[PDB]
């Protein structure tokens, strides 16, 4: 129920399902962006995953245990978005991040645009470690999207 | 509302991947509710 990997986050009522996001299972903990689940519980097969840690300002939440993803963008190298878009299999997209310059420091940011239900897809370093999650960002003047590389603290 | 998860793959770097996107340098602000906004 908590096997390592990337997962779709789905919702259903009485009819079909909608993909609202994506997340990462690592070390028994499920990691996603807060705006995907609004911090509500998740079903995994016949099991229930309860929220454990989260932070709306970071737009992150973890289930079953504390945040486990510790790898950091090195501030230099190309990265890969492992995008899991609604209705499409996972795909890797390589990019050189730009930068969100904030009063509190710089954050890597990727100029890659996917449907909203791709939120929570992991961004990877060359060793395959998850350096953050995709899906909290800004829309620039021409309507295109730039996502922070959002990482928590382990 | 039934919110549930389903496995979608392994987490692996792809060798010889397609490279796309620019590297924008943007001034942003982050509010207490987690919204990023461009500084105008």
């Amino acid at each position: 129920e908590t096997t390592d990997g990337v997962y779709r986050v789905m919702t259903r009522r009485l009819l079909g399902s909608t993909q609202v996001g994506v997340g990462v299972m690592q070390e028994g903990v499920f990691h996603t962006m807060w705006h995907v689940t609004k911090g509500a519980a998740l079903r995994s097969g016949e099991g229930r995953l309860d929220p454990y840690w989260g932070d709306v300002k970071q737009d992150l939440v973890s289930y079953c245990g504390p945040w486990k993803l510790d790898a950091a963008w090195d501030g230099l190298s190309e990265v890969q978005l492992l995008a899991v878009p609604p209705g499409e299999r996972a795909k890797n997209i390589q990019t050189l991040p730009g930068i969100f310059k904030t009063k509190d420091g710089d954050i890597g940011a990727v100029a890659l645009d996917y449907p909203a239900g791709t939120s929570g897809s992991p961004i990877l370093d060359k060793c395959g470690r998850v350096i953050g999650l995709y899906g909290n960002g800004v829309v620039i003047k021409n309507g295109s999207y730039v996502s922070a590389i959002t990482q928590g603290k382990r | 509302v039934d919110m549930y998860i389903e496995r979608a793959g392994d987490i692996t770097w792809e060798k010889d991947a397609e490279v796309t996107g620019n590297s924008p340098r943007l001034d942003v602000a982050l509010d207490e509710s987690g919204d990023f906004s461009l500084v105008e």
């Binding site: 449907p115 239900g117 909290n136 | -």
Partner: peptide, 4 residues
């Protein structure tokens, strides 16, 4: 974004 189909900002989030």
């Amino acid at each position: 974004k189909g900002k989030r």
